[PDB]
Ligand binder design. Structure first.
Ligand SMILES: CC(C)CCC[C@@H](C)[C@H]1CC[C@H]2[C@@H]3CC=C4C[C@@H](OC(=O)CCC(=O)O)CC[C@]4(C)[C@H]3CC[C@]12C
Ligand SMILES: Nc1ncnc2c1ncn2[C@@H]1O[C@H](COP(=O)(O)OP(=O)(O)OP(=O)(O)O)[C@@H](O)[C@H]1O
Ligand SMILES: Nc1ncnc2c1ncn2[C@@H]1O[C@H](COP(=O)(O)OP(=O)(O)O)[C@@H](O)[C@H]1O
Ligand SMILES: CCC(C)(C)/N=C(\NC#N)Nc1cccnc1
Ligand SMILES: [Mg+2]
Ligand SMILES: [Mg+2]
Length: 1159
């Protein structure tokens, strides 16, 4: 059925429309239902038997076994028909050398052998088809299971450090695929034992008791292999672990690369990554050594068994083997060797699949979530640690009114929102929803999908243009969407163009405002926005747009100024509600709280590269040693054939030495390919990481994180664990096939003729496959990436998926995507099997031609002996060549990144001319600075001239987009400085090597970036600082008491992204990280964006007292903060409108500073 599609590949590239829809019984829906029923039946037995964990294996079996039984039936028939070549060759040799007389005609037996071979190949391929069908069905079912699990796991699992979003991505990408491949190969595990045993029985029939000796030597494969497997298992587990850890670090390095670079710590984190990589490579080396030992055993136990059998026969049966007995025995030994070719692969994949299924079982047994709109009574909600973060929560969110939940950093605002939404463990009390009706949740950390602006804003609703315009204008996104490549259809989020923090937060708030649900939980919508955007959003989006619909709005804001427009105020302190009521009620009951609020408001070449990565000697050793090994093997076969055909101590001794050489060469050839693979993997990963780290920040901003992290994650896996086995099998099969053809052509010269036409045939089929395959390959890739993406974007932002209660829609989307990917992979496998079947028929034609040529004298028998195995090893050559082409494509992907640009770290000034303490006085002097982020972009900064005196506190304030951050980054030479000079303390910063300009200046970015590890690791990765310095910095940052009360102490774990602390606490950790460095110039960029007014006030006072001598330049979120500063530089569209003292610019009425101050 494929033939037509393959030939159509030329005229019309095969697309998903040329490809058909998946059958009814192959859809992910039905397979998922079946597997879920089986897994739940296994679960039922967990309660009956103590510690009886549900086994994914028995569920898989109950759901998809019978197809595997049919496949194994086909494989058994394939083996029984494969035990026909022995008889046919024996009869051919008997008759050529010389009603049961018609049958002995060598030509009749040649025809029968051809028929038996084609039938055997047909049955083997039928087994393969059934198995790949079952394996694809099972991959679909398991993806659906893990997805419906992701939609139920508790957020505490990711927040408390149990698992990582990266681990789930890894599950989906790698581990299910490995299980699928093992299932593809699984029938061998019970078809190879049967075949080898049956062949040993027939060897007993032919030779006699002698065969039993060989039989014993064959059975030793079973213990040995088992042992090997165990060790491999261990190694693999270790590998996995380290890999995970390493990737975690890599991921973080790629997300926080801007902070690492600005702090000059890039190399330290890179070195930690490299150490974890060294551990992973040690694990992989153990794995590879045991793989090579596996290959040695599988290839040498045949040789030793042959030696033992035939020497035992030489010294047991005085009667010599007649030529027919000899060739029958040698042919049976070849039939035994054939299954042992793939034994290494099956044991390897079975071990890896056992490990992957352990991981999948663990993940499928993880923790899962359990006029007043919402009335909470006596709630003690906790965040999974058994320690109540909210205690005695008594709240009432009145229907159709505005509830503002206000408190200082870490008072349970987001915690209370997620408690009402039910994402955190309940310990007492109840939440009454006058059974959660869908609530539109704007999370503190905005979560954007990979779709367009429009798709993110609508988010599962019909496009009502009136509502869309109203929302997009209330959020003030309209001036921002048009500047994008495509107005509203531009791709947002990861795998698309990256918006600024304010833009993304406003997309999130627009999404929340658009959905037609009765309740809207907005969590800190006014953090990234400046005063103008926030005020517009409040005055239109919340006070007007959401009050026309009478929707119940719950606002989590640090902006006390907006409290005057609130109907209900919930004041939070230390996880409890101090006071709940109207402004007047709080004024009467809690006088001091109202007074405090008032005070606060102041009121291929890739293949050659891979082979030669090992120094040009491992390639030579591999190829030469393999050639000599196979020379010895052919010599052994010829020795047996001739010695037994002609019919002594001489013969025994010669055969013994040949077999010993064969075993030694087996060892030598086994080690080479694995050593090559290890060397290449090490070199490739080292180069990739080094070149990524040293890249310019522009490269990271322009390119999606997806591509780089995909390289590191899943291309290194291919280079490590998939290229070496494929290459080894390719080389062995190709040598076997070339040697066969050579032996046949030397025995029967005329065979050369048949070789050329058939060769042509081979060529053509390759050609056709190699076009169609590629097309289908692309489809596979193009279908698989969205799928993974979906998983990712549902794992991250799960609270939003389950706050809007759009779980069903997302489940259906996943089902659709997995069905499409399954169609793609099914037809890729179909092209593969088309090629394999055509090559099998080509091989059968070779067997027939060689047979007929030989029939019309021991050399010509050996010719047929090899003709038989041509059929198997040609198939293997072709399959492995295709796989190797794909994996060399992966190698190409890795090698592509080695031509990136590098930041010019060298610099011009000799390090001697740079004083030991360069920023001593800390006197910045900007002269006519012009700055554009990338080449050929309008100058974000134009003609900036300012002179900051030593110890002159400077404020910078302007509308969002005035390039204040561009100056902040210009001090560190990240934005390209076309013209002008920033002379800091006597040295032009353009000359200094970057690691002296980045190292001696400290910046606090608005976005908090916390790296996984201890608090100590995030405050100083170098571990130089004394504990007292860390405590000093934490006290300045107003986080000393919380860390004192943290369990671990100053070693308390900080889960990935600092998710176990509130956003404000993350920002304060960043402030402390900047404070430890004790540099002389401190550029704080909106450092108090997420910090409430009280903590902001006290922290500003303390940071000003402690860093009085240093020069601090603060880009102010509130212009009120920098009113008391010696110098104030107000930017407006890249130009400094005025540069004077605070009081002077304030005195001049109708000025930009005075305007901002008045507002
Ligand atoms: C030698 C002839 C007769 C058959 C060739 C293959 C067989 C020897 C069978 C019998 C024992 C089987 C092996 C014994 C058990 C394992 C370990 C298994 O991994 C584990 O058991 C997990 C590791 C652990 O036990 O801790 C992977 C399959 C494998 C290699 C089996 C693969 C197929 C084997 C080698
Ligand atoms: N995802 C989380 N998992 C576990 N514990 C958390 C998580 N988020 C916060 N906490 C804990 O909750 C305590 C209170 O933080 P909370 O989540 O209420 O912050 P918030 O007040 O909403 O944030 P902000 O300071 O931005 O207003 C913090 O001490 C932190 O230990
Ligand atoms: N990573 C970037 N790459 C290229 N251009 C940028 C980048 N970030 C900001 N810009 C541009 O620079 C201008 C000012 O941005 P920014 O420096 O963030 O202002 P702010 O003072 O609000 O930080 C914007 O109008 C935007 O077009
Ligand atoms: C049985 C082991 C000896 C060395 C006696 N013979 C082999 N070993 C292999 N491989 N013969 C062979 C040749 C070509 C293709 N397949 C098998
Ligand atoms: Mg909050
Ligand atoms: Mg900014």
């Amino acid at each position: 059925w494929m033939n037509t599609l393959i030939i159509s590949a030329h005229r019309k590239p095969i697309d998903l429309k040329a490809i058909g829809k998946l059958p009814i019984a192959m859809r992910a829906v039905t397979n998922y239902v079946c597997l879920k029923e089986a897994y739940e039946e296994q679960k039922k037995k967990a309660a009956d038997h103590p510690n009886r964990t549900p086994s994914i294996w028995l569920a898989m079996y109950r759901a998809f076994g019978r197809p595997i039984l049919l496949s194994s039936t086909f494989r058994y028939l394939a083996d029984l028909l494969g035990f026909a070549g022995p008889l046919c060759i024996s009869g051919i040799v008997q008759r050529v050398n010389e009603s049961k007389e018609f049958l002995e005609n060598a030509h009749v037996l040649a025809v029968l052998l051809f028929l038996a071979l084609i039938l055997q190949r047909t049955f083997l391929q039928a087994s393969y088809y059934v198995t790949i069908e079952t394996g694809i069905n099972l991959r679909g079912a398991l993806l659906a299971m893990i997805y419906n699990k992701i939609l139920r796991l508790s957020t505490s699992n990711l927040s408390m450090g149990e698992m990582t979003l990266g681990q789930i991505n890894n599950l989906v990408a790698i581990e299910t695929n490995q299980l699928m491949w093992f299932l593809f190969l699984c029938p061998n595990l019970w078809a190879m034992p049967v075949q080898i045993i049956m062949g040993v029985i027939l060897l007993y029939n032919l030779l006699g008791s002698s065969a039993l000796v060989g039989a014993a030597v064959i059975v030793l494969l079973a213990p040995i292999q088992y042992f090997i497997a165990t060790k491999l298992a261990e190694a693999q587990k270790s590998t996995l672990d380290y890999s995970t850890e390493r990737l975690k670090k890599t991921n973080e390095i790629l997300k926080g690369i801007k902070l690492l670079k600005l702090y000059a710590w890039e190399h330290i984190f890179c070195k930690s990554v490299e150490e974890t990589r060294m551990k992973e490579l040690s694990s992989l080396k153990t794995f590879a050594l045991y793989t090579s030992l596996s290959i040695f055993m599988n290839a040498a136990i045949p040789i030793a068994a042959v030696l033992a059998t035939f020497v035992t026969h030489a010294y047991a049966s005085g009667n010599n083997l007649k030529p027919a007995e000899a060739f029958a025995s040698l042919s049976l030994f070849h039939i035994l060797v054939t299954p042992l070719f793939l034994l290494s692969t099956v044991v390897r994949f079975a071990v890896k699949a056992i490990i992957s299924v352990q991981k999948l079982n663990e993940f499928l047994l993880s923790d899962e979530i359990g006029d007043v709109a919402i009335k909470v009574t006596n709630g003690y909600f906790s965040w999974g640690s058994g320690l109540a973060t909210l205690s005695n929560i008594d709240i009432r969110i009145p229907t159709g009114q505005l509830t503002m939940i206000v408190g200082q950093v870490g008072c349970g605002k987001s915690s209370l929102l997620l408690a009402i939404l039910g994402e955190m463990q309940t310990l007492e009390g109840k939440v009454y929803w006058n059974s959660r009706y869908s609530v539109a949740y704007a999370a503190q950390k905005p979560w954007l999908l990979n779709a367009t602006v429009e798709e993110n804003i609508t988010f599962g609703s019909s496009f009502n243009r009136q509502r869309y315009k109203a929302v997009t204008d209330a959020c003030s996104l309209q001036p921002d969407i048009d500047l994008l490549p495509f107005g509203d259809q531009t791709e947002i989020g990861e795998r698309g163009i990256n918006l600024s923090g304010g833009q993304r937060q406003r997309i999130c708030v627009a999404r929340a405002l658009y959905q037609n649900t009765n309740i809207v939980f907005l969590d800190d919508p006014f953090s990234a926005l400046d005063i103008h955007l926030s005020d517009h959003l409040m005055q239109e989006g919340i006070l007007k747009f959401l009050q026309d619909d009478k929707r119940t709005v719950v606002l989590v804001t640090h902006k006390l100024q907006y409290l005057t427009h609130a109907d209900w105020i919930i004041a939070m302190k230390d996880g409890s509600v101090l006071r709940e009521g109207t402004l007047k009620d709080i004024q009467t009951k809690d006088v001091e709280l109202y007074e405090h609020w008032k005070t606060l408001m102041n009121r291929w070449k890739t293949c050659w590269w891979y082979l030669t990565s090992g120094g040009f000697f491992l390639l030579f050793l591999m190829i030469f040693s393999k050639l000599l090994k196979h020379s010895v093997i052919v010599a052994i076969d010829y020795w047996l054939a001739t010695w037994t055909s002609e019919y002594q101590t001489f013969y025994v001794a010669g055969f013994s030495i040949l077999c010993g050489a064969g075993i030694f060469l087996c060892l030598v050839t086994s080690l080479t390919v694995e050593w090559m693979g290890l060397t290449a993997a090490k070199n490739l990963h080292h180069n990739l990481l080094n070149k990524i780290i040293l890249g310019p920040i522009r490269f990271f901003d322009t390119t999606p994180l997806g591509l780089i992290l995909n390289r590191f994650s899943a291309d290194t896996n291919i280079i490590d664990q998939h290229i070496p086995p494929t290459l080894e099998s390719l080389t062995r099969s190709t040598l076997l096939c070339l040697s066969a053809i050579g032996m046949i052509s030397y025995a029967t010269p005329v065979f050369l003729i048949a070789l050329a036409p058939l060769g042509v045939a081979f060529y053509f089929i390759q050609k056709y496959f190699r076009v169609a395959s590629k097309d289908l390959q692309e489809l596979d890739d193009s279908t698989q990436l969205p799928l993974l993406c979906h998983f990712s974007e549902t794992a991250e932002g799960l609270t939003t998926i389950r706050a809007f209660r759009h779980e069903t829609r997302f489940k259906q989307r996943m089902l659709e995507l997995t069905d499409t990917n399954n169609i793609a992979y099914l037809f890729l496998s179909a092209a593969n099997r088309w090629l394999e079947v055509r090559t099998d028929y080509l091989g059968a034609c070779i067997v027939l031609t060689a047979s007929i040529a030989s029939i019309s004298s021991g050399l010509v028998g050996l010719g047929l002996l090899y003709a038989l195995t041509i059929t198997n090893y040609l198939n293997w050559v072709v399959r492995n060549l295709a796989d190797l082409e794909v994996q060399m494509g992966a190698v190409k992907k890795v090698n592509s990144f080695l031509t990136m640009e590098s930041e010019n770290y060298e610099g011009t000034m000799d390090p001697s001319q740079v004083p030991e303490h360069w920023p001593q006085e800390g006197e910045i002097k900007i002269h006519d600075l012009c700055v554009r982020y990338e080449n050929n972009l309008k100058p974000v900064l134009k003609h900036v001239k300012a002179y900051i005196k030593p110890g002159q506190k400077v404020g910078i304030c302007g509308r969002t987009g005035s390039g204040k951050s561009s100056l902040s980054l210009a001090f560190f030479r990240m934005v390209d400085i076309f013209d002008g000079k920033i002379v800091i303390d006597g040295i032009d910063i353009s000359k200094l090597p970057l690691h002296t300009l980045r190292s001696r200046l400290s910046i606090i970015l608005q976005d908090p970036i916390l790296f996984s590890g201890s608090i100590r690791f995030n405050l100083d990765p170098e571990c130089k600082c004394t504990d007292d310095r860390l405590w000093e910095a934490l006290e300045i940052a107003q986080l000393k008491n919380m860390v004192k009360s943290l369990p671990g102490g100053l070693d308390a774990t900080v889960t990935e992204g600092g998710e176990n602390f509130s956003v404000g606490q993350r920002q304060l950790f960043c402030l402390a990280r900047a404070f430890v460095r004790k540099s002389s110039i401190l550029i704080m960029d909106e450092a108090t964006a997420s910090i409430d007014m009280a903590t902001e006030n006290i922290l500003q006072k303390v940071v000003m007292t402690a860093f009085a001598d240093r020069t601090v330049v603060t880009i102010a979120h509130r212009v009120s903060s920098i009113m008391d500063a010696g110098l104030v530089l107000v930017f407006s569209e890249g130009i400094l409108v005025e540069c004077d003292t605070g009081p002077n610019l304030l005195q001049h009425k109708n000025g930009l500073f005075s305007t901002l101050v008045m507002t």
